[PDB]
Paper text:
Here, we present a fluorescence-based, genetically encoded AGM biosensor, consisting of an AGM binding-domain derived from the putrescine periplasmic binding-protein (PBP) PotF from *E. coli* fused to a super-folder circularly permuted GFP (sfcpGFP). In the sensor the large conformational change of the PBP upon ligand binding is transmitted to the fluorescent protein by altering the chromophore environment and thus triggering a change in signal. Previously, we identified AGM as a natural ligand (K_D_ = 0.22 µM) for the periplasmic binding-protein PotF.
To examine and understand the binding of AGM further, we solved the crystal structure of PotF-S87Y-A182D in complex with AGM and compared it to the wild-type PotF structure. These distances are compensated by the bulkier ligand AGM but are most probably detrimental for high affinity binding of slim ligands like PUT and SPD.
Numbering used by the authors: 27 to 369
The structure:
């Protein structure tokens, strides 16, 4: 008799405009849907406990770090009859963080690559600018030429150091402290005078408006920037590269806090997300690949056929995933990132 409620916490710009409304119309459940613009906000609230959320959207990486902390509770697959729709390849990658896929429902995934302005890069570096390579943004001679049109990096040491280590021919997940303080920091300090800022969201609208011409960014965010520029009929042409040397893949997942009050409603929402049209519609709006293999044909051609959103087998084989480091490396990385950004 009483109203059924559900509290969700997700990234901004990571659902379709009508997803929640459609769910409410179909199920009668009241949804309170809150958003963050950085996962540091989510992670800080989960670690503090008693969030009031029934569903949250962490990284598979963070989820691994909190598996022993009891932040999350295992998902009851009997309430998720469309679980069979999830792509088995992605389930296996997520399971590196969540054995036997016990706690997390893969949601969307993408890569950390290069977002850029096509016209500005070709004006500055020529028609043969190496947009297919990390050389575009990790060679100082190129960044010096791009300095004035604006360069940004993510403010994310784990991802940036891993990208740098892969580029140098080191283990992207090296456990050697000297790899970070030595060769990775050396390259970063060479590049640093040419970097306008380190920020993990300002780069989206700056790419869309023409204010930055190259950025390390998350694929779907860059594709959103490209679409925003198109809708603004502003002439700006943004693209994204998964470079030929490889790149980091990441997997955002739905998970259920251990103190969730509205569990039946949360399962209804997850099984709704597993219906192929629901997550295909989300992908159509947010320009991220969903993790549902049944959904892929339903995604619009512009999105499904974009190999920087849905990469093919050869590109997938070049992606690496982040591993959890020992605390001693975590601290070396954080210390070194502060040095890089300082100067
Ligand atoms: N960095 C992640 N793990 N996800 C980024 C998602 C952003 C959706 N607007
Ligand atoms: Ca991840």
């Amino acid at each position: 008799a009483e109203q059924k409620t559900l509290h969700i916490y997700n990234w901004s710009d990571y659902i379709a405009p009508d997803t929640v409304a459609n769910f409410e119309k179909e199920t009668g459940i009241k949804v309170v849907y809150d958003v963050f613009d950085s996962n540091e906000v989510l992670e800080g609230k989960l670690m503090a406990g008693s969030t009031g959320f029934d569903l949250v959207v962490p990284s598979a990486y963070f989820l691994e770090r909190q598996l022993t902390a009891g932040v999350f509770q295992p998902l009851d697959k009997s309430k998720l009859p469309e679980w069979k729709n999830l792509d088995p390849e992605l389930l296996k990658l997520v399971a590196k963080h969540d054995p036997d896929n016990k706690f997390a429902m893969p949601y969307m995934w993408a890569t950390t690559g290069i977002g850029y302005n096509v016209d500005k890069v070709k004006a500055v570096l020529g028609e043969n600018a190496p947009v297919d390579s990390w050389d575009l943004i990790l060679k100082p001679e190129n960044l010096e030429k791009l300095k004035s049109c604006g360069v940004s990096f993510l403010d994310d040491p784990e991802e940036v150091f891993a990208t740098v280590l892969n580029y140098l021919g080191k283990d992207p997940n090296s456990t050697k402290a000297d790899d970070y303080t030595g060769p990775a920091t050396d390259l970063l300090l060479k590049l640093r005078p040419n970097i306008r800022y380190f920020h993990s969201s300002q780069y989206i609208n700056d790419l869309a408006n023409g204010d930055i011409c190259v950025a390390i960014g998350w694929a779907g965010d860059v594709w959103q920037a490209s679409n925003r520029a198109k809708e603004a009929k502003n002439g700006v042409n943004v693209s994204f590269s998964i470079p030929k040397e490889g790149a980091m893949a990441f997997f955002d997942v739905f998970a259920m806090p251990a103190d969730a009050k509205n569990k039946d409603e949360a399962y209804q929402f997850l099984n709704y997300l597993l219906r192929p049209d629901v997550v295909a519609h989300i992908s159509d709006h947010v320009f991220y690949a969903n993790a549902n293999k049944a959904a892929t044909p339903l995604v619009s051609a512009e999105v499904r056929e974009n190999p920087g959103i849905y990469p093919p087998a050869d590109v997938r084989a070049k992606l690496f995933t982040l591993k959890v480091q020992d605390p001693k490396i975590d601290r070396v990385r954080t210390r070194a990132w502060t040095k890089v950004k300082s100067g």
